[PDB]
Ligand binder design. Structure first.
Ligand SMILES: C[C@]12CC[C@H](OS(=O)(=O)O)CC1=CC[C@@H]1[C@@H]2CC[C@]2(C)C(=O)CC[C@@H]12
Length: 432
């Protein structure tokens, strides 16, 4: 009935801005932490032929000859870089991976930074939920926008990796409160019919945001400038999040009808197990793909933009596909297709870059088709549990990438096989 009792155009807009800058802040470490060509610092090179004698074949990116082989050997003439590394600055002027030597034995620290962020989202989305009964949606949006801004601008002045990772947890903690408050305010200040559409617009804004990261990165190579450009813009959103009025529904349930009466006046003046397995799988493979842009194709800038774009195309195709097929076949088929695409990429040769990029973009699009279909199917307690499982999956997606050291193919094989397995679960244990 509250839909009946019930500024929407303006509100969604005051929200397109945070939604356009959120993907940049989550998927920033694909460009700020990119891995540049690295080699051992050798006395013969930093104090073309000199490269060979100083550094063995693989130029190996982790070890160097103790004594130069003017003979050009045994693995015994190799020593780990005791003196450090010399990173290439041709493509990436500055990356965190170069600042805190996140290479070789530490190559897993980059995927962990991306999972500390994701955990910071889970722990945050949980806490902000508890504090939701006590504090309002608008104050929480405004604070969480400032928290993200302060912490995000602050990371540029972080002296050690621990502090960087810690200040990315705080930024993610804040972003969780932004996701919650934004969605909750928009849903609750619109009638139930327009609830869907509004969500489609928010989803499109996120897709444009992913695309825009590729562009922002193409312009701002320095990691410090990229972090400021993806964090500072939040201070403004915090100041422009004041006009948005507090959720009337919250006020009434809270107990304050007089305050609720004022805002409305102003606006006017203006199965479970199968589901969990699918939601975990989609997001443990999605996040794996979106956090591993460099392993997919060599051009990361094009790839991020294309990923953001293939989401819009997918949304639009989804409808026609659903016009003929069903919410179950589409989901399973799309998931299977995404897994197959991830498997194809690992197999496709490095030389054929266009093919590798095409398969990755097909994978991202297909994950988008499955995540759209799942949402419709999901709604048609449980939602909260699923989201908690989905967030856990997104925190174990960037973590499987830590295993690349041991088995390079482990990451793509796991994303592929898990996706294909969920495809079967959707097909057998989900109705229409
Ligand atoms: C799933 C996706 C789009 C991709 C984003 O991935 S990201 O990490 O690059 O921001 C995350 C993201 C966050 C919110 C999601 C959105 C897709 C559309 C969703 C499911 C709705 O209808 C309501 C909430 C929306």
């Amino acid at each position: 009935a509250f839909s009946k009792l019930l500024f929407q155009t303006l509100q969604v807009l005051t929200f397109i801005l945070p939604c356009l800058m959120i993907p940049s802040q989550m998927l920033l470490e694909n460009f700020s932490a990119a891995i540049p060509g690295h080699r051992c610092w050798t006395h013969m090179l930093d104090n073309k032929a000199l490269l060979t004698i100083s550094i063995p074949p693989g130029p190996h990116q982790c070890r160097r000859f103790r004594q130069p082989q003017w003979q050009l050997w045994s693995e015994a003439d190799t020593e780990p870089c005791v003196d450090g590394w010399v990173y290439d600055r041709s493509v990436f002027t500055s990356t965190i991976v170069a600042k805190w030597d996140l290479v070789c034995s530490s190559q897993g620290l980059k995927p962990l930074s991306q999972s500390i962020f994701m955990s910071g989202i889970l722990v945050g989305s949980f806490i902000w939920g508890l504090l939701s009964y006590r504090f309002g949606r608008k104050p929480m949006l405004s604070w969480c926008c400032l928290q993200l801004a302060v912490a995000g601008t602050s990371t540029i002045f972080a002296p050690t990796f621990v502090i960087y990772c810690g200040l990315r947890f705080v930024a993610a903690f804040g972003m969780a409160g932004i996701f919650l408050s934004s969605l909750t305010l928009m849903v609750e200040w619109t009638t139930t019919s327009r609830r869907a559409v509004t969500m489609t617009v928010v989803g499109c804004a996120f897709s444009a945001g992913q695309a825009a990261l590729g562009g922002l990165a193409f312009a701002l190579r320095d990691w410090r400038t990229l972090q400021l450009a993806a964090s500072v813009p939040f201070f403004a959103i915090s100041l422009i999040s004041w006009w948005l009025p507090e959720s009337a529904r919250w006020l009434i349930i809270k107990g304050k009808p007089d305050q609720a009466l004022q805002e409305l006046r102003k606006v006017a003046r203006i199965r479970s197990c199968a589901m969990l397995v699918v939601n975990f799988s989609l997001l443990i493979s999605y996040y794996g793909l979106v956090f591993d842009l460099q392993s997919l194709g060599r051009d990361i800038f094009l790839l991020q933009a294309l990923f953001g774009a293939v989401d819009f195309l997918g949304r639009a195709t989804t409808a026609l596909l659903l016009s003929f097929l069903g919410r179950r076949t589409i989901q399973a088929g799309s998931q299977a297709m995404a897994g197959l695409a991830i498997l194809a990429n690992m197999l496709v040769p490095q030389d054929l870059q266009t093919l590798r990029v095409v398969f990755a973009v097909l994978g991202k699009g297909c994950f988008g088709i499955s995540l759209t279909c799942l949402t419709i199917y999901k709604a048609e307690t449980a939602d909260g549990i699923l989201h908690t499982v989905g967030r856990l999956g997104a925190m174990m997606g960037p973590l499987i990438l830590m295993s690349r050291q041991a088995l390079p193919l482990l990451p793509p094989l796991l994303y592929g096989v898990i996706s294909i397995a969920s495809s079967l679960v959707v097909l057998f244990f989900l109705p229409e």
